[PDB]
Structures are given as structure tokens and as C-alpha cells.
């Protein structure tokens, strides 16, 4: 099952050495066999042998199987994090960035630190990863904001969103703010998400997809009066007839999930007389 989690982070059963070496005869490119073989050795606390197996996998798996290679590198990161030392993990990490996509490897160690609840080490790696890649990747900011909101550091999250804006190209500013806003609804302060969305539609009033994401968040949170205020703001905006049907349909359909047939008629009435205009 140790390999089930490696496969997760990457996005007649064999019971002996001879069994695995026999499996590896016909399946040299299978990272799953190699990881199971590593887990077998790890369950017997045979750490050096597990490490040697990973080295073999790196040389034995066909060089074009980058996905199988990634699994091994993640398996080594996990192995070193759990059974090795700071220095032993650092070497594997630096080596893995050499051979695979460095940002991806950075992302995987972050996920590993979180899983093993080395929160302090996650926070330091976030800072370093955002310094190296933050000018290019919005995901590092979102993931770092996620971390901070999950550890009840709202104000630090605002600071990080500020630094994300200074570092990212202007063309990504709406996206990073939009994902911090969704993060606040999901894990943090919805009032803070509301404020972020307000600023987005304040600056890009014609970005009608933003009005949509915004009302999806308000619906998912189920404050029906804020959902209704938002729906009625939206239809007094620069939208096409095609889009107007969509928002009225979504409005109606939400009220059908609220059991208020007085307002569900209100929408039909007001929807149909919108088409009038």
C-alpha cells in the first residue's frame, strides 16, 4: 500500500526477493513492481536494499518512460523523508530536480512534507519554490495560499497573494486572485473570498465568466439571500441573450433546490420578461 500513495502523489502475489526478481525479468519498465519490491524491503526495515532497488530502477526502466521514472523519484523522496536524514533527502531531491522537471519535483516534496506533517519544512520549501518559480507558475502561489489558510494564517495568505501579484505577469493576476477567492470559500473566510471576487468584477466588469464563478461560490456556500442579491446584479450587466438564459436557468434551478415556490415563480416571471426586452 506504500506504493498506492506514491501513485497517488504522482498525479500468487510476490512475497520474496526471487518473486520480484522473477517479475522484473518480464516487466523491467514497471515502476509499480519496483516500488512493491522496495516496499517489501522497507517492511523488513532493509533500507539500504530498498535504496539500491531504486537505483536499479533508474538504470533499468527505459529512459523514455518518464512517468515510470517519476514514480521512482517520488518513491525515493518518500523513502528518504521517512527513513533517511536531512542530508540523504536533500541529495535525492537535488538529484531528482536534475533529471525530472524541477518544479514538479519541488511540488512533490511539498506534498510529502504536508503528508508527514512537517509543516515547518513545507513553509520553508514554499518560500524557496515561489522564489525560483513564482514569476512563472500561479499554482505555487495557490498551493502556498492553501497551506497558510489550512493552518489558520489568513493574514499571511493575504501577504502571499500580494507577493504573487508582484511576481506574476499581469495576464495571470485575475487567475491567481480568483483561485485565492475560491480557496477562502472552501477552507477559509468566505467574506474574504467575497471581497476578492468583488474586486475582480470591479476591475473586469465584462468578464462574465467571473460573475459565474462568483455565483457558483455563493451557491455552494448556500447563503440564499447573498445568492439572490448576486443573481439580480448579474442580469443588469453586459450579457448576451444566450448567457441570460443560462443565468436565469441556473437561478431557477437553484430555487428549485430551496423549496421556495414563490421566488421560483418570481424568476420565471422576471426571466420571461427579460426576453421581452
Author numbering: 1408 to 1418, 1456 to 1721
Can you list sentences taken from the study reporting this PDB entry?
Among the many trans‐acting factors that are strictly required for ribosome synthesis in yeast, Rrp5 is essential for the maturation of the two ribosomal subunits and, as such, has been found associated with early preribosomal particles 6. Rrp5 is a large multidomain protein that contains 12 repeats of the S1 RNA‐binding domain at its N terminus and 7 TetratricoPeptide Repeat (TPR) motifs at its C terminus. In vivo, the N terminus is required for A3 cleavage, while the C terminus is necessary for A0‐A2 cleavages. Usually, S1 domains are prone to nucleic acid binding, while TPR domains are seen as protein–protein interaction modules.
